[PDB]
Structures are given as C-alpha cells and as structure tokens.
Design a protein around this ligand. Structure first.
Ligand SMILES: [Mg+2]
Ligand SMILES: [Mg+2]
Ligand SMILES: [Mg+2]
Ligand SMILES: [Mg+2]
Ligand SMILES: [Mg+2]
Ligand SMILES: [Mg+2]
Ligand SMILES: [Mg+2]
Ligand SMILES: [Mg+2]
Ligand SMILES: [Mg+2]
Ligand SMILES: [Mg+2]
Ligand SMILES: [Mg+2]
Ligand SMILES: [Mg+2]
Ligand SMILES: [Mg+2]
Ligand SMILES: [Mg+2]
Ligand SMILES: [Mg+2]
Ligand SMILES: [Mg+2]
Ligand SMILES: [Mg+2]
Ligand SMILES: [Mg+2]
Ligand SMILES: [Mg+2]
Ligand SMILES: [Mg+2]
Ligand SMILES: [Mg+2]
Ligand SMILES: [Mg+2]
Ligand SMILES: [Mg+2]
Ligand SMILES: [Mg+2]
Ligand SMILES: [Mg+2]
Ligand SMILES: [Mg+2]
Ligand SMILES: [Mg+2]
Ligand SMILES: [Mg+2]
Ligand SMILES: [Mg+2]
Ligand SMILES: [Mg+2]
Ligand SMILES: [Zn+2]
Lengths: 208, 234, 138, 150
RNA sequence: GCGGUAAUACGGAGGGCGCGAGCGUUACCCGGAUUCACUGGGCGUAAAGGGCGUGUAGGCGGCCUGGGGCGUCCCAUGUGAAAG
RNA sequence: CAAACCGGAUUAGAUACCCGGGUAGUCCACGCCCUAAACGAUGCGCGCUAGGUCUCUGGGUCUCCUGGGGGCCGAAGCUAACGC
C-alpha cells in the first residue's frame, strides 16, 4: 500500500502489536513477541524519559501507521473532524473507520489493510453494486460493500472468505458470506473500536 | 464553676498598647487603662467552658501553655491537677509542628532516667557520667510535662496569646483549637475560644485556670476540692 | 471634587468589606440607592438604610461576610468577592440586550441602567432591554 | 492511589570558599483525577531525594477542585507574583488546552476540558503556584447560594 | 552556541527521526508579541512625571424636581448583488 | 576665596592630589542665558481604608479632645524585591 517498507519495524517502534500484516502477526512473530524492542543499533539501551511532545507525537504515529495513510491525508481528516460537530476526537476515529480501504479489511476480505488497499485499487471491490477503486472513498451508512462479480472465484478471495465463515464482524457491520457482501450499518462509536491509541493525545499533538 | 462578680479586681488591664481589634471587649479608658467589658468576659466564658466540657467528656487532652513568669507556677499545679500536659518554662520551635522530632527529647528523658536506676550509673566512664547526668537535668526542666503528650492535643490553653504567639501559630497550622486567656494587647480573632480577662496578674490567671480545671475534673469524673495554689498566690 | 460618586460608593464598599466592617456610610443619591436595592435583593449585602450624619443625608450599607474559617487566617470568606465599575466618565459603556455579559456564568451579577430602570443582567435579558453597563459584582 | 507527575527539577548552586556547592529542586503534583490536587516544592541535596520530598510536600496542601462534566464552574484569572493565569471553561471535546505546567496540575485534578492562558511572567514555579490559587478560588452555584442566604 | 588530540553540534560511514512526488532553502504577511495593551501594559530604584507655577482651548463634573429626547435602549421595516 | 595661569614639592612621569602666588569669577545694578542628581529620581485634585509614638503651630469642657504641618513604627493591602 502506502509507506511501503518494513512494517514490523513500526510494530517495534510503537512497542505495540500493530498488526500491519494480519496473518503472520498472530504467529510467533509480528516482530514483537521475540525481540520486542525498538529497531536500530540502539533500540536496546535503557530508554530515556520521553518529552511531553514525543509522547503526543509517538501516539499519533501509532494511529496513523495503523490505517496506513499520508500525514497530508490524515491531518485533512482530523481538521475536518475538528470543524465538525461532536467530540472531535471520536469523530476522527469515525472518519478513519469510514474509509473504504479499511471497511474492506473490517469485513475480512483482505487479511490486512495493505492488502485491502490493493484489493480496491485493482478494482475487486464494489460499493452499492458500482465499482470503486479508491481507498479514500467514504462509506456512508446504508451502503453495501460487495466483492466484484467477476472477481469472485479468485484465489486470494476464496481462502480469505472460507476463513471468514464462522467469524464475527463488528457490531456496526453486517456481512453475509457466499454473497461476498457486507453492509455499513453505522459509524462506530468510540468504545466500539479497540485501538491501542489514547487518541485524546492525538488532538493535543495537532495544536502544538 | 461560676462567679460573675468575680471582677474582684481582675476585670480590666493594660494601658494603650492595645490591639484595636480588641475594641469590642473594652468598657472605658478609666485613667490610662482600658477596663474589660465585664458582661462579655462572663458570656464568652459561657461558650468557652462549654467547649472545654465536651473535651473532657470525649476524653481528649488540653495543652496548658503559659511562659509568662507572673503565671508560671500556677500553670504547673492546675495542669498537674488535671491529667493534661503543660509547657511551662519556654516554648520550643515545633512542640507541635515538629512534634515527632521534638519527642526524641522525650524518648531520651524517660530512657535516661532508666540509666539512673541501673548498675550502669556506676559503669560508664565519668567522661560520660558528668555529661549524661547534667543532660538529664535540662530535659526534665523544659519537658516536665510535655512528656505526657503522646500525640498532638485536641486543644491548647494559652495564658498570653501575644506572648506565646508561636504557640498559637503552631496550633492553627495543625488546626488545633486555641483556648486563650486574653486581654487588650492581643488579636482576639486569632483565637477560637476567648476568655477576655487579663494575661498578667495572678489574681486573675489562677482564678481562671482554677475554675477551668475544676470544670475539667468535674466533667471527667472526680468532683474535687480547693487547689494547691488558691490564695497561695503572693 | 468627587468625579464619579458611583465608583466612590462601589469602592467605599469594597474598602469596608476587606477589613470586615459591620456597616459603612455612603453619601446619598436615589441612583446610588437604586443600586443598593439590587445589591440587597441579590444577596450581596444585608441591606441599607437612610441614616443621617451631621444633618446631611447618607445611606448606611450593612455588609455581609462568610463564616469564620480554618487553619491560620480565620478571616471569613467575603460575599462580595469582587465589585468593579464598568462604565465611567469619559468612557461610558452601553450595551444592546444581545450584548449584556454573562458574569461568571451567572454566579455573579452585572447591574445596568435602562429606561425601564436599574436592573440585573438576568433582569434585562429576560425583559428585553439594554443600557449603560454600570458594574460587575461577583 | 495518588498519581505523581513532577513539573520541573532544577539544579540551583551557592558559593562557598573554593568552589560552588550544588542543590536540587523539584516541583511535583499529586492528583486522584477526581477533584483532588496537590502541589509540592521539594528542595534537597540529591535529585531523587528532592523528588520524594516534593511528593510528600504535595500531599499536605491539597485543593478540592469542583469539576463539572470535566470542566470548571466560573472562569478565574489569578495573579501570583508577576505571573497571571487565565482559566476558562470549555465544552466536552476541547481537551486541556494549556501550557505544560497547568496541564500537569489540571489533568491530575481531573479537568478533561478547559481553556488556558499564561500571562505576564512565565516562571514555571510561580505559574504553578497560581493555577493552584486559581483552583483554590473556584466557587460553584451551590456554595454561592450558601454565601448569600441568611 | 560547537571545533584548542578521547567532537551524540564540523566531514564521511552505519544506524535513527520526520515528511514523501516531493523535500529543503531564501523572501514576505499575521501569529505567538497583553512587545502600542480598546479587549489587554506601564513611569520610587528596570525605559518613562514636564524644573515650578499661572492659566487658553479641550476633557471631566455634588444633591432634589420638571420639560425636551441629542447620546443610549427597544419594536417594525427598507438596504446589505453574485462569487467567497 | 579662587578656573586659567606662575612657581615649590611628590613621582618612573605628575599637564593632579600637597605647598606659596594669582586673573576671570565670586559682590552690586540693569539686561541676557533656561540648565541640573532642577530628586521624595514619586504630576495635580478628591473620596475611602487599624493603630502607636515623637515634634511644629491653632482651638476647646485643657488627665485630654479637636484641626493644620513635619518625622518614626506599623493593621489591611500592595511590591520583582528593596520597600511603601
Ligand atoms: Mg503581655
Ligand atoms: Mg503585576
Ligand atoms: Mg515578559
Ligand atoms: Mg575523535
Ligand atoms: Mg573536548
Ligand atoms: Mg555526529
Ligand atoms: Mg545540530
Ligand atoms: Mg497560534
Ligand atoms: Mg498584538
Ligand atoms: Mg511593560
Ligand atoms: Mg540608573
Ligand atoms: Mg529610570
Ligand atoms: Mg516633579
Ligand atoms: Mg523645560
Ligand atoms: Mg528631569
Ligand atoms: Mg491649574
Ligand atoms: Mg476650562
Ligand atoms: Mg459640562
Ligand atoms: Mg451629574
Ligand atoms: Mg432632565
Ligand atoms: Mg433619541
Ligand atoms: Mg453576497
Ligand atoms: Mg590664596
Ligand atoms: Mg593653589
Ligand atoms: Mg570680563
Ligand atoms: Mg542679574
Ligand atoms: Mg494650651
Ligand atoms: Mg499629622
Ligand atoms: Mg503585612
Ligand atoms: Mg514583603
Ligand atoms: Zn507485525
């Protein structure tokens, strides 16, 4: 997807299992288990107290590097979520989570988001029966996210959905397998996601 | 536990070195001396003695502080009469706010007297014997009845607010209620329970602490007689 | 001379309370009095009354404080924490009804003078006028 | 129990014949995040001691802060020395918008949404002593009503 | 503020942080700067009381009542193009 | 009496401090000059907010009370502090 580099060296910088890879991250790796310290020749010496700033910075990185998104595109969302009405923090989360590239991951078509990004850019994903090849596209509520009719018997997709048979998908998403079809029921609320981010902090970093 | 026309001669006192804050409790400037509003001395006494009652009933202690020499001896008897402790010679920096650290001096006195009932007063070099026996001297001299205190007291009775003002300040910083025998040179508002009498002149002083300790015993359970002091005040 | 007689009073009061007087005397005017009417109503004083010193007419204000307090410094809380002239000579301050200020989220008042007469902030807004913003009190 | 933060530690220095002789100071805050905060200034010979000392100092000197939905009753401004602090209530979602010193104090008090301005001298010590005073001075409609009844 | 022979501050290397079809630089405007302060500052010793008076214009002006309604406040109504 | 100046000393030098002289000047009148650490380094007016003590000058029932002026100490409060 974007960033396109070593992802698990980011798991190892945030000191958190980030799952930027899905499958193997559940193995005995994700980088974290076995070697859970920072990347670089130095990331194993006694860590100095993070400045007030680093703390709020590293926390944003933790959120942005999850959804795999340019800072230019992250901040654009945050500012919008800011101007918007409601707890500007959770509206932000609502917005990231409303992204098509991510909703495809949530409905387990891809096993990662990097994989879900490409699944869209290569046109295997449809919204409301029309095709959408933009990771950015904002899913609204009531929309149905299908797997493209002529993409259905594809290898990467088959394994990915026989694995989805018998698994639960978020309380704000519908999903029927065999039909390769989801449904965006509602914008998730703050306690619906289990993100390892303070998020309150992310707001503070964008007013430094 | 009363007397109203115990003006006697112990009503008004002090000239014009007054705290103007003491203006309510004064009657007139009868010839260079403010004389104390007689009535108020008796009705402040009402609400005051009332206070002290509930203190003896609940089983708490009152630290009697009087350093002024014209009241010094009187404090010793009336404070010994009641179980309560007294500060009599001089008042030390942190009897209360430093009450732990100060009590090491108590930890030593009680323990240094234990040296003087042992075979080790014959043992130990006389280099120690002279020093460690004239050290016990001074200890018993200041803490003769501070040692009775094992924790901070529930209240504190001072005979001169102005003069023992370090005692007062320490009480407040630890929120310990101040009873005080006050007159025209003092700041009444700095005191919780006031007996607007006169800090100096034994004829007052003792009368007050007599009747007060009367009341303390009377309310604890003992109902007693005349005092070791009384008209033995000359 | 006495250039602002309202500030004189407002102040006279501020001064008296900070040394905890029982009452204080201001020389009298209906307009001054019409303010004390509000001070009194809203709980800031105990009330006032036209006394008479040396044969000239004053308004004795009766001040009001908290209860005695704890620790060092037992001087009670003030009731009139804060009280200050807004409009003054050579800077008169007038406000529309849409501009009458919310003082301390209403924990305090703001007396103003309108053509319906002297009034609190809440009074004018819930009565539709504006006027010369006299003073905040909180 | 209580949460400790520590706003600055510094290394003061005095002169004695032949050399300077050092010392350390620590400003620390304690809070239960439910309306209680304490500010402690602990000076002492070596660093971690000066912290310990502050924490203790900070626990006497507590302020009972009257939170309301994460913010404050009125808006105070306070002068301590040449430092001025300005506190302003804000609706939910605003966050602590504050300089790094009253932030320490406010977050630990449990204010989750507020507006702030440091005005005048910005000495971190006097600024801390000021927001403490600002907090000490908050009244609610509850306690104001008591004041002006009778 | 670093460099005077053990440089995390110079030049290279490995590693790391930040953005990324961009990233840096210089220039300019507002911000932080309550640092021209109306909101929101000061002048005994930090910059700042005129050497002192007399007084012109101007600014400001005690208590009570009545008229007017300029300031001030309120209601209605017209105007405030489109773009932004 | 004393800038400049003329001498004597001192000194490494001594265009200075010390010593002996000495002109303007210092004084007066009239006319200019308009400065200053022209200082309380604190503009003028009025109102308010504990007291104590010393002093100058009024008044009254004259142990004291009541004005005006000059100091000191201090309540509240203020001040970066000193202080006020
Ligand atoms: Mg005395
Ligand atoms: Mg200031
Ligand atoms: Mg500054
Ligand atoms: Mg080298
Ligand atoms: Mg070096
Ligand atoms: Mg280097
Ligand atoms: Mg550098
Ligand atoms: Mg800004
Ligand atoms: Mg500006
Ligand atoms: Mg300035
Ligand atoms: Mg100078
Ligand atoms: Mg100057
Ligand atoms: Mg002058
Ligand atoms: Mg001039
Ligand atoms: Mg000048
Ligand atoms: Mg004039
Ligand atoms: Mg004129
Ligand atoms: Mg005029
Ligand atoms: Mg007028
Ligand atoms: Mg008229
Ligand atoms: Mg008109
Ligand atoms: Mg338009
Ligand atoms: Mg001569
Ligand atoms: Mg000569
Ligand atoms: Mg000539
Ligand atoms: Mg002349
Ligand atoms: Mg005479
Ligand atoms: Mg005088
Ligand atoms: Mg003071
Ligand atoms: Mg001071
Ligand atoms: Zn991983």
């Amino acid at each position: 997807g974007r960033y396109i580099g070593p992802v698990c060296r980011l798991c190892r910088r945030e000191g958190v299992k980030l799952y930027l890879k899905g499958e193997r991250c559940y193995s005995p790796k994700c980088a974290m288990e076995r070697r859970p310290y920072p990347p670089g020749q130095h990331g194993q010496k006694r860590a100095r107290r993070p400045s007030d700033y680093a703390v709020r910075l590293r926390e944003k990185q933790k959120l942005r590097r999850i959804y795999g998104i340019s800072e230019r595109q992250f901040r654009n969302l945050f500012e919008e979520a800011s101007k918007k009405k409601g707890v500007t923090g959770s509206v932000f989360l609502g917005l990231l989570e409303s992204r098509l590239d991510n909703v495809v991951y949530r409905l387990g078509f891809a096993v990662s988001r990097r994989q879900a990004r490409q699944l869209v850019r290569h046109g295997h994903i449809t919204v409301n029966g029309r095709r959408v090849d933009l990771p950015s596209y904002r899913v609204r509520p009531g929309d149905e996210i299908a797997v493209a009719e002529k993409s259905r018997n594809l290898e990467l997709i088959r394994q990915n959905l026989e694995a989805m048979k018998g698994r639960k998908v978020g309380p704000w998403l519908s999903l029927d397998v065999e039909g390769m079809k989801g449904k965006f029921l509602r914008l998730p609320d703050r306690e619906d996601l289990a993100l390892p981010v303070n998020e309150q902090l992310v707001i503070e970093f964008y007013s430094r | 536990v009363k007397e109203l026309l115990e003006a006697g001669v112990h009503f008004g006192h002090e000239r014009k070195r007054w705290n103007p804050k003491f203006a309510r409790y004064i009657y007139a400037e009868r010839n260079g001396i403010h004389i104390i509003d007689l009535q108020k001395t008796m009705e402040e006494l009402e609400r005051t003695f009332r206070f002290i009652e509930d203190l003896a009933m609940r089983g708490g202690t009152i630290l009697f502080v009087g350093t002024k020499k014209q009241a010094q001896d009187i404090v010793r008897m009336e404070a010994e009469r009641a179980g309560m402790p007294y500060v009599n010679q001089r008042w030390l920096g942190g009897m209360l706010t430093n009450f732990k650290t100060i009590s090491q001096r108590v930890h030593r006195l009680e323990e240094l007297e234990a040296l003087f009932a042992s075979p080790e007063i014959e043992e130990r070099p006389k280099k120690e014997q002279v020093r460690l026996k004239h050290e016990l001297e001074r200890l018993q001299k200041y803490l003769s009845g501070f040692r009775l205190l094992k924790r901070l007291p529930d209240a504190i009775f001072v005979v001169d607010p102005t003069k023992e003002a370090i005692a007062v300040r320490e009480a407040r910083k630890l929120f310990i209620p101040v009873i005080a025998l006050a007159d025209t040179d003092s700041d009444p508002d700095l005191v919780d329970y006031i007996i607007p009498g006169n800090d100096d002149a034994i004829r007052s002083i003792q009368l007050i602490l007599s009747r007060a300790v009367d009341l303390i015993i009377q309310a604890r359970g003992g109902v007693v007689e005349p005092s070791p002091s009384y008209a033995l005040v000359q | 001379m006495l250039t602002d007689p309202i500030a004189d009073m407002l102040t006279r009061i501020r001064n008296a309370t900070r040394v905890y007087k029982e009452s204080t005397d201001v020389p009298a005017s209906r307009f001054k009095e019409e303010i004390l009417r509000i001070l009194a109503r809203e709980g800031f004083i105990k009330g006032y009354e036209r006394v008479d010193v040396d044969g000239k007419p004053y308004l004795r204000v009766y001040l009001k404080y908290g209860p005695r307090r704890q620790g060092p410094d037992p001087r009670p809380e003030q009731v009139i924490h804060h009280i200050r002239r807004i409009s003054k000579p050579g800077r008169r301050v007038y406000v529309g009804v849409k501009e009458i200020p919310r003082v301390r989220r209403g924990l305090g008042i703001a007396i103003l003078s309108t053509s319906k007469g002297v009034l609190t902030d809440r009074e004018a807004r819930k009565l539709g006028v504006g006027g010369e913003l006299i003073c905040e009190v909180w | 129990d209580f949460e400790e933060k520590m706003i600055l530690i510094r290394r003061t220095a005095r002169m004695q014949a032949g050399g300077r002789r050092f010392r350390f100071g620590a400003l620390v805050v304690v809070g239960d995040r439910q309306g209680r905060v304490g500010l402690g200034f602990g000076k002492a010979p070596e660093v971690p001691l000066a912290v310990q000392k502050a924490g203790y100092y900070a626990r006497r000197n507590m302020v009972e802060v009257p939170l309301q939905n994460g913010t404050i009753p009125h808006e105070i401004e306070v002068e301590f020395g040449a430092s001025k602090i300005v506190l302003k209530p804000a609706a939910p979602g605003t966050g602590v918008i504050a300089g790094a010193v009253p932030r320490a104090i406010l977050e630990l008090a449990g204010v989750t949404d507020i507006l702030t301005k440091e005005l005048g001298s910005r000495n971190p010590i006097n600024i801390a002593y000021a927001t403490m005073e600002a907090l000490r001075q908050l009244r609610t409609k509850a306690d104001v009503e008591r004041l002006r009844k009778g």
